[PDB]
Design a binder for this molecule. Sequence first.
Ligand SMILES: O=C(O)c1ccnc(-c2cc[nH]n2)c1
Ligand SMILES: [Cl-]
Ligand code: NI
Ligand SMILES: [Zn+2]
Length: 350
Amino acid sequence: SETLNPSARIMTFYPTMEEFRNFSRYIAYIESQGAHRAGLAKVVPPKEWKPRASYDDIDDLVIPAPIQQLVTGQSGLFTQYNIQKKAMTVREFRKIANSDKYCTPRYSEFEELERKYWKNLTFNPPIYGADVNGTLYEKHVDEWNIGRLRTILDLVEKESGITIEGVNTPYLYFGMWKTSFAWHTEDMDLYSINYLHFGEPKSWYSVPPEHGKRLERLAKGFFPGSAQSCEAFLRHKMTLISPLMLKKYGIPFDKVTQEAGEFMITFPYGYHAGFNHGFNCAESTNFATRRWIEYGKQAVLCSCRKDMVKISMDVFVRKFQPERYKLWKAGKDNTVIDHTLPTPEAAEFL
Ligand SMILES: O=C(O)c1ccnc(-c2cc[nH]n2)c1
Ligand SMILES: [Cl-]
Ligand code: NI
Ligand SMILES: [Zn+2]
């Protein structure tokens, strides 16, 4: 376990069509290769795979709650404030995104675009067509369908009827240049799948789950007010920290750029952040493996906010940890998580 991906670098996978067909099995496989150690992995689907025939019929799709992203800060430390704007179609969004005021600046290397992002982050607040309920997958697509992955996370809706928008349902994200996703782990420290349907790239930063607590200590020191009001303030998804600040305080991290037609997998307790290069569309949801259950049980949740995502772990412990159920209910389950260990389903690849 502590022998596979010892550098904990972001890994990229190129599955065959046969490998790609079984979603859960392929997650088990990439974990047997140590992909989870970085907290983030890229999966390039087979060349002949397409989730939709064309994206020429979606300009009339409504973005019910577009978000203007106001960013305040200096010296690589920032807080993002969301200003909800009026409903707009993808049509109206693509116009504003590709306009002279909001379009991508001219650049050669990614390092130049990255530098311009961290330099101009607080100027000309962009609009993010975020958290749009829906899928762009065609009903017949059975491989990696974000709308129906069929992992154990389905036990939440199957047993309780509870649907959590974007968590056990898909979300669509219409981006423009300089739109950001702040430093965070998933709700309940779950996995996530992200597919870039079309457009300009999405760049990502990732902190290995092995070093997540170090990132939290750093953030707590930089925003002591926030940390005092809520232990899990990073779950508010308002905190932006430049890679130079991470480098300066010895926090290990890696970076990757996701192109259209590529998937990104985030792993339990994997801190990630990033930005969009220009106009694009991404689809995402959360998912689980048997390895996630312990992460769900130990997840430090946001106290201070109402409507914060909290999944009852009871059904998972009863079904997959019956021998530890009574101990866990009594608050005596003292299991320590080994972030290097792959999911039990990977046993066949080890
Ligand atoms: O907006 C995005 O590009 C994006 C990327 C990575 N993660 C999330 C997220 C939001 C809630 N959970 N994960 C959103
Ligand atoms: Cl936090
Ligand atoms: Ni995320
Ligand atoms: Zn909070």
